[PDB]
């Protein structure tokens, strides 16, 4: 795969497969200070992608009307946005 | 059909919204590929402040996460809500 969605949903649903697998069979070892750091910059990036695509969206879908250079740059400045992501959405 | 509606739609629209461009001018108009790169361009900076406080809400809520089944569990369906404002 390529894109950090894509690795992020990759990497989680093997380590959720991963899990049910030693539930099957006692293996939870203890987080590493490298190891959550490593977790917490690829999820923040995954969830920045899905947060990038769908600002993209809703900017040009809101940017549309505008027709004029001071118009759009009067309309984005405007802009305020509320976004929900999730990592069930990758 | 219903696209092929759209793809004369889109056509026909593109041939209005010109001619209305046009006479806009006889009394600064916005080309195709120039909204384009001030929207991406716009669109990356906001992007880029969801993206330093998702970073915030991840980290934080990676707090009583202690073992590697336990943040494999919280981050499976984590969810956050983002607000973001040119103004900032």
Redesign the interface.
Known sequence: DKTYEEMVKEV?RL??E??TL?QKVSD????TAA??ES???S???A??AV??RK??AK??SR?AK????????SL?????????????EL
């Open positions: 989680e380590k959720l991963n899990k030693k939870d070892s203890i987080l190891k959550r977790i917490i910059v999820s923040s990036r969830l920045g947060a990038m600002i993209e900017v040009r940017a505008a027709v004029t250079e001071q118009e759009l740059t984005l400045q405007s802009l305020t946005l509320r976004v929900d992501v999730s990592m069930e």
